[PDB]
């Protein structure tokens, strides 16, 4: 990922009063994946053929 | 082409039928062995009638 001028220049503070960015700012990447699995169900149990 | 690594198929997953049918909250078993301190003996009870 590329960051973003406004980020590099909203990282440092000294903005103006009522700004948002009066004070340093920190940036926290999170990714999240979304997949796709079986269940099996017998003898009255379940169980994870490949977990 | 690149070589792709191996996928390992590790399933088990064979659960356990921990939970009883309804709630099998019945597992009854008696004292057996008498208890610990087995205590004295016949303790003389006799008869008391004035013979």
Request: one cysteine or more; proline letters at 6%; aromatic letters at 6%.
């Given at each position: 990922?590329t960051?973003?001028?406004?980020?590099?220049?909203?990282?440092?503070?000294?903005?103006?009063?009522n700004?948002?960015?009066?004070?340093?700012?920190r940036?926290a990447?999170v990714?999240?994946?979304?997949?796709?699995?079986?269940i099996?169900?017998?003898n009255?149990?379940?169980?994870?053929?490949?977990? | 082409?690149?070589?792709?690594?191996?996928?390992?198929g590790l399933?088990?997953?064979?659960?356990?039928?921990?939970?009883?049918?309804?709630?099998?909250s019945?597992?009854?078993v008696?004292k057996?062995?008498t208890?610990?301190?087995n205590?004295?003996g016949?303790?003389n009870?006799f008869?008391?009638?004035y013979?």
């Amino acid at each position: 990922v590329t960051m973003s001028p406004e980020s590099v220049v909203a990282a440092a503070g000294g903005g103006n009063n009522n700004s948002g960015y009066n004070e340093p700012q920190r940036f926290a990447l999170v990714v999240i994946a979304v997949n796709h699995n079986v269940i099996r169900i017998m003898n009255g149990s379940m169980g994870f053929p490949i977990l | 082409n690149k070589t792709i690594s191996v996928t390992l198929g590790l399933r088990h997953w064979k659960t356990v039928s921990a939970a009883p049918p309804e709630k099998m909250s019945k597992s009854g078993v008696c004292k057996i062995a008498t208890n610990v301190y087995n205590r004295d003996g016949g303790a003389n009870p006799f008869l008391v009638k004035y013979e």
